[PDB]
Each structure stands twice: as C-alpha cells, then as structure tokens.
Amino acid sequence: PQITLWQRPLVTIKIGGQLKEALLDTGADDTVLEEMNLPGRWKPKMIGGIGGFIKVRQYDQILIEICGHKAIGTVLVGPTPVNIIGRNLLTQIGCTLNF
Amino acid sequence: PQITLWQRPLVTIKIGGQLKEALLDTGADDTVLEEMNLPGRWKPKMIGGIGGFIKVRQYDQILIEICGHKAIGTVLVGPTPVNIIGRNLLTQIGCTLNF
C-alpha cells in the first residue's frame, strides 16, 4: 500500500499472538515495543533520541507480521511512548520512501 | 527518487543558503533542526521523544529545500541527535511510504 503522511503512519502488527498498533518510523534504526514479555533470552541496550536515552531489553530473531507481511528481526522492549517499527523490519517488508 | 531503508534515509537540505544533512522521519510529526540561527520570533513548544519531553524554539514560515524540493513551514530548533524532517514538510514535498 502507499501510505501518505497527513496522519501518523500507524498499522496493526501481530506479535506473539497479540494484535498491536505501531508507527512506521523511518527515523528509528530499530523496532522498539512497549513493555511486554517475549520469550527467549535478552540483552540490555540503551537507545537514544529526543529527550535522551532509555534502557531496553533486546530480543533477537522475533517474528512480526506488519500489515500481513512477515518479518524477522531484533525487537527492543522498553518504556517507549508508542510501538515503533524501525528500519530493521521496514526493509524486510520492502518499505521505501518515495517523492 | 525512491529511498530504501538499509541505511538511515539522510538527505541534503538547504536552509539559509547553507547545506545540512537531515533524516526523512515518518515517525516525526514535526521538523526539528539542531541549534542554528533562524530569522524572526520563535514561540515555545514542548515535544516528546523516546527519552521524554524537551523544550524547543518554534519558527514559522521557514523555507527549506529538500533535494531541491522547496518547502515552507514550521521548523523546531533544540537538542536533537540529528536534523529531522517530520511529516509537516514530508507531505509538502509529496513523500509517501510504499510497500
């Protein structure tokens, strides 16, 4: 689909049987999800942005379906204000920016 | 042009006759530039990021050229990791996300 940016580009994601809403962020290197329990071991990481850094747990090779398409990648989970789909998974679905 | 997301989507912007690099960021409502001298009065604006809220100075009617595309709008200036072109200007140059 071709999404315009008059509004926040929000889509529904299916992650570990849960249906969620997330932001397609081309300004995010990585996908950061709001706090939740994901299986598998994790590693602490710090990610920054506007307002500074938050500590997140990094999980590798998580499967997410973005708008029906499947993608595997790193998924950070932390005190993020919104679920964010970053570049790491956007590439996976064939996302591009055009103008 | 069509921009892939394998690497940060960095573009050259021309502002005040100066060239700068800025990220095309669909997860940003607004355009935030690192500290710079802009013309006119600014008004106060609070924005939220991954780390929390910060205060920025808001300038209206700033002409910016993004890849030779002329845009005229609101530009925010404050402590940002990098210059970010938000959906306010992205919609002005006709940017869409496609997949």
Binding site: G27, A28, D29, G49, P81 | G27, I47, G49
Partner: peptide
C-alpha cells in the same frame, strides 16, 4: 537511535 510526537 529513534525519532517526536
């Protein structure tokens, strides 16, 4: 890094 509301 991640990007503003």
């Amino acid at each position: 890094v991640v990007x503003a509301x």
